[PDB]
Antibody, heavy 218, light 213 residues
Framework: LLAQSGPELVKPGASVKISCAASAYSITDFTIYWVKQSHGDSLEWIGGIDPHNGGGAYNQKFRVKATLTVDTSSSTAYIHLNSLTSEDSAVYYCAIFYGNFFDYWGQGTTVTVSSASTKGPSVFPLAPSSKSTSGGTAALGCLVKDYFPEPVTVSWNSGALTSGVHTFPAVLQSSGLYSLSSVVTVPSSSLGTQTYICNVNHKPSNTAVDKAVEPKSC | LDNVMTQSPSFMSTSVGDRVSVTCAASQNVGTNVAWYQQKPGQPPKALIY???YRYSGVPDRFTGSGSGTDFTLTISNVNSEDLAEYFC?????????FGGGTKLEIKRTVAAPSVFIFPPSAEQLASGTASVVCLLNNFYPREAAVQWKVDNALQSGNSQESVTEQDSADSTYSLSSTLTLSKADYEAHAVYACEVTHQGLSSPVTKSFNRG
């Protein structure tokens, strides 16, 4: 589960400690390493350690920038990133591996270096109506507007609804804030049986919204 | 002295059923200490192969790797829709460990025309001073599509943005949203809102509209 710490908004010049814990098994029984991914593309190996049999290593590039530590007591790994700049904005992956086995990675931690303050999103319903229903199919959703930084998780009915859901990539507005929509397709005959709730989470601002989206009325 | 891994190609589109090959060339002899990763949209990179040709548990046998020294290959046979992803080669012979630039595998499929839905701005948002109109184009191929906004028949410009989904894992189609943003005041001054969409799958443009109220 390599459970990693949540998304972080850090001001330039500041630092951050990203944590990583193997729930169920002791993470320090294996070799742990971190990788940096920028712009959702290129992967950079930062370094790693193996608490029990040495062979810990750093990437010359991140020597000054990063410090890796382990906490055997609570089976948790750490990376310390100091003197952060905009070039440090990225997704950081914690990974553990043993010889010829599991090469297992964590969900990743999004780090954004900004002098800007967090802004939680507004969540408005995208109500289904005769103009949001094709035949027996209806579309509905949630508009997640004006937030910073990334990311933001969206789920439907607490995760019980996954088929037909499209969650769009966030897009920047001229305000410098992010915005995205999440829509789902459902049987138009179901519109009046089970409720539809979108679960929006924005960790950096501590925003947790549960918006119910119902057909338009007057 | 630093092992740069050059991956090819950058993008690769294939049909369900086909054999595809991804190349990776190391600037320096790396033996057989090469591995391959697959990163599906929204997920962490997952490890497929190690030691050039060995597959990790739970990895389909239609994924095989080969090569030695400086040249390496990832072959994906009977390509399936679920395979849509970004692939990375890696060298762990010498420190630091390095990755290739990655290869994006996209799946070709037949033309599919989009389903179009329009959504007026919610009442809750209007009480906040702004108005977002959303036009959804659902489950279409290929990716290119034209969304035109018209307000009381007047063609809009400079006030909308588009977002596009990554190809779907099951049916390989795309979805698209187009958001028209007006001020509460400008939205209230007009009546007919419409998004017109043009697409390879439609023999003629499709228009979806609604009246304010």
């Amino acid at each position: 589960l390599l459970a990693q710490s949540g998304p972080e908004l850090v001001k330039p010049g500041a630092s951050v400690k990203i944590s990583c814990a193997a729930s169920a098994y002791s993470i320090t029984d294996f070799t742990i390493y971190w990788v940096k991914q920028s712009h959702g593309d290129s992967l950079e190996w930062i370094g790693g350690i193996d608490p029990h049999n040495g062979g810990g290593a750093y990437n010359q590039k991140f020597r000054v920038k990063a410090t890796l530590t382990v906490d055997t007591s609570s089976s948790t790994a750490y990376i310390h990133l100091n003197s952060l700049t905009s070039e440090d904005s990225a997704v950081y992956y914690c990974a553990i591996f043993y010889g010829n086995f599991f090469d297992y990675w964590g969900q990743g931690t999004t780090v954004t270096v900004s002098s800007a303050s967090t802004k939680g999103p507004s969540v408005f319903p995208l109500a289904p109506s005769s103009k949001s229903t094709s035949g027996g199919t209806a579309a509905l959703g949630c508009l997640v507007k004006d937030y910073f930084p990334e990311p933001v998780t969206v789920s439907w009915n607490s995760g019980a609804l996954t088929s037909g859901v499209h969650t769009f990539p966030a897009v920047l507005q001229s305000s410098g804030l992010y915005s995205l929509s999440s829509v789902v397709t459902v049987p138009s005959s179901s519109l009046g049986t089970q409720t539809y709730i979108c679960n929006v989470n924005h960790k950096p601002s501590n925003t947790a919204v549960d918006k119910a989206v119902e057909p338009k009325s007057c | 002295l630093d092992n740069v891994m050059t991956q090819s190609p950058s993008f690769m589109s294939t049909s369900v059923g086909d054999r595809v090959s991804v190349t990776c060339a190391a600037s320096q002899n790396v033996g057989t200490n090469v591995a391959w990763y697959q990163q599906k949209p929204g997920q962490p990179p997952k490890a497929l192969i190690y030691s050039t040709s060995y597959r990790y548990s739970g990895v389909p046998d239609r994924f095989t790797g080969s090569g030695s020294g400086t040249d390496f290959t990832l072959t994906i046979s009977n390509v399936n829709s679920e395979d849509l992803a970004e692939y990375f080669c890696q060298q762990y012979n010498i420190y630091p460990v390095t990755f290739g630039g990655g290869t994006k595998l996209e799946i070709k499929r037949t033309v599919a025309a989009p389903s179009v839905f329009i959504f007026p701005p919610s009442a809750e948002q209007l009480a906040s001073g702004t108005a977002s109109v959303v036009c959804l184009l659902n489950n279409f191929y290929p990716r290119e599509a034209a969304v035109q906004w018209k307000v009381d028949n007047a063609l809009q410009s400079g006030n909308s943005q588009e977002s596009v989904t990554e190809q779907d894992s099951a049916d390989s189609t795309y979805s698209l949203s187009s958001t028209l943003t007006l001020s509460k005041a400008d939205y209230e001054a007009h009546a007919v809102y419409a998004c017109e969409v043009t697409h390879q799958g439609l023999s003629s443009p499709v228009t979806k509209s609604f009246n304010r109220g």
